Structure 1
Amino acid sequence: SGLVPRGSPHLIKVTVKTPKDKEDFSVTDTCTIQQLKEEISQRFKAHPDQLVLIFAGKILKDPDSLAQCGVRDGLTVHLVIKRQHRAM
């Protein structure tokens, strides 16, 4: 409608799969791993340090963008959420 499209190139959807859960995330394609960790913390209610993200069998590193990692629209990132200890 008008000059504005229904969708965008910058707006992808990636599946975050844990051993127990499967959750979709709308993300920008240039979103960094650290920013995705933050989005995931807010979704699962976890601290980012709990989070381990894997794609193409590689543990993903905070500064990289999703695009640099090879994560594209409709693909799956694996997530392990390290369980909090009972005590410090």
Structure 2
Amino acid sequence: GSLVPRGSMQIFVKTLTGKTITLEVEPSDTIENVKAKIQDKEGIPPDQQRLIFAGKQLEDGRTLSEYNIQKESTLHLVLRLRGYADLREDPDRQDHHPGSGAQ
């Protein structure tokens, strides 16, 4: 199916190699949507990919806006296990879409 055009802001995330990677996630989207973009950056599974906020890990159910994660929020990715036993390849990627809704 297609994707509906909704709000989307840019955030700052830090890696284990002291490298900051730029990511984009909707204000209503959840952590599940965030890692989705990370797959293109490093390409790691959810069991190994975990988001941290204010020292507290993040999980699904809630949205970025609920985690006080703004366009200037600092995210951290911590890995516990190892995977890299999968692949990822599909068109219609790397495309910027418009926004909508109120705040």
TM-score range, shorter chain: 0.7 to 0.9
Residue in structure 1 matched with residue 60 of structure 2 by the alignment:
62
Partner residue of 1:10 out of 7, 25, 31: 7
Structure 1: stretches of 5+ with no match in the other structure: 1-8
Give yes or no for contact 1:12–1:74 (8 Å, CA) kept in 2.
no
Higher strand share: 1
Structure 2: stretches of 5+ with no match in the other structure: 1-5, 84-103
Q: TM-score, normalised by structure 2?
A: 0.65
State the 4+ residue runs in structure 1 displaced beyond 3 angstroms.
none
Residues paired across the two proteins, number: 77
CA distance in 2, matches of 1:71, 1:79: 14
CA distance in 1, matches of 2:43, 2:67: 25
The answer to whether structure 1 residue 41 and structure 2 residue 39 are counterparts is yes
Residues 38-79 of structure 1, C-alpha deviation per residue, up to 9 Å, x if partnerless?
221232111121111111221001221100000001221111
Identity of aligned residues (%): 31
Aligned-pair RMSD on alpha carbons? Answer: 1.9
Letter of the structure 1 residue corresponding to residue 32 of structure 2: Q
Q: TM-score, normalised by structure 1?
A: 0.74
Residue in structure 2 matched with residue 30 of structure 1 by the alignment:
28
- Structure number with bigger Rg: 1
